[PDB]
Amino acid sequence: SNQAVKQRIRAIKNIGKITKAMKMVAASKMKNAQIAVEQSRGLVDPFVRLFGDFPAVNSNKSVVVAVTSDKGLCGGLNSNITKYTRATLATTESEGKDVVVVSIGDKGRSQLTRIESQRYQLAIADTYKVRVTFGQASLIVEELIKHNPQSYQILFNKFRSAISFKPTVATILSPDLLEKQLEDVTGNSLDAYDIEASHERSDVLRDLTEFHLGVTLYNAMLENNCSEHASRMSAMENSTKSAGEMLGKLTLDYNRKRQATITTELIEIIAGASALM
């Protein structure tokens, strides 16, 4: 009773060290993952000025991707894009289409099957363990084109700053299955370009859409990884603050119980002495 408070104090005083440690650890990871993110931000731009940005397409088959975290101490980041992927799956699904749901991160498979169990078909995880590369993102992309959809939707949290993480949806279309159909503007918007490929335009557009899906998947899971680190650094600094406040109230109450203990045993000793003397 007056000893369990002394152990609770030591437990909370240790939690206020562990969370401060991993706040510093997440800060050190965030400051060097931001370097890779703002270098990876470049290559996504030529595809979104060459292929445009068409989220609201009439795909008859879609693959949505929710890019989540692996370690689950992030603070409402993974469920934010779970809300967003159940909002965008309730935006394209109005015509009777097939949707495949995959997720990158173990916090995706644990929060996507709760909202939707049948369309979820694949779980990529252990991505951020060593580092995130482009061969890895391209292997994930090839396992996404093991299915044959007409669109791909990527959901990720974009590292605007260390405070703001705007959840970005990113779209890729299958080449002449939907990309050539969505460009037909009384003719085509792609006929201005002179194809210098070894083969025809459908083959270079197939290769271009695979390369575009790879670079947006790489940039998506870089942006989400460093925004995960930033939300962990901010989420273990609202945690060590609350664990300092709880420790302060515990120390004040322990001191009250300490003083009341010394007075209580003293009064009992005095009563026992006056009952004799």
Partner: protein, 177 residues
């Protein structure tokens, strides 16, 4: 043909009438880019915007006046108001001139787009510049690439890609200034 005007302007509509109001409309990668392809301008004379890209690096954002790109049908050169061209590149050297000085990167292969506003986008995977390649381990690799002919077509294609990369890396390492 144009019967589905998709887009971030119009995704906002179908999303706002069908998603819960506690979420604002999610962002899109077109909101983060300032430079489009069909729009007006960004040539102004001789030097046009060249954007050299790898996944792990940005190597050039500066304005150049000519670019020498190694397409699969040969090394072509991009002047200022060049015709719009989606060009698949084979393994070769990319030369970004500005005047007397130029930056020569040997790349690994990957497309290079020229846009109707003169914006040129070189998009390769590994751009290993010429003063960091060794000239000794190239022959040690293309020796096995010349020798090994497997039974499967997959490693056959890998060996053909190997020899067309290593042979091009031969021709651009002895004849350097």
């Amino acid at each position: 043909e144009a019967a589905a005007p998709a887009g971030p302007k119009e995704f906002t509509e179908v999303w706002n009438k069908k998603a819960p109001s506690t979420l604002i409309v999610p962002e899109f990668p077109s909101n983060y880019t300032a430079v489009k392809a069909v729009g007006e301008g960004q040539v102004h004379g001789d030097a046009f915007p060249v954007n050299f890209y790898t996944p792990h690096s940005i190597l050039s954002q500066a304005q150049k006046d000519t670019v020498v790109l190694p397409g699969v049908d040969g090394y072509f050169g991009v002047k200022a108001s060049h015709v719009p061209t989606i060009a698949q590149l084979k393994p070769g050297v990319v030369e970004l001139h500005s005047g007397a000085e130029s930056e020569k990167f040997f790349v690994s292969g990957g497309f290079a787009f020229v846009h109707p506003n003169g914006v040129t986008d070189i998009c390769v995977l590994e751009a290993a510049t010429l003063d960091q390649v060794d000239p000794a381990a190239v022959k040690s690799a293309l020796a096995a690439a010349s020798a090994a002919q497997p039974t499967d077509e997959f490693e056959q294609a890998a060996n053909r890609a190997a020899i067309e990369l290593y042979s091009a890396l031969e021709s651009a390492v002895e004849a350097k200034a």
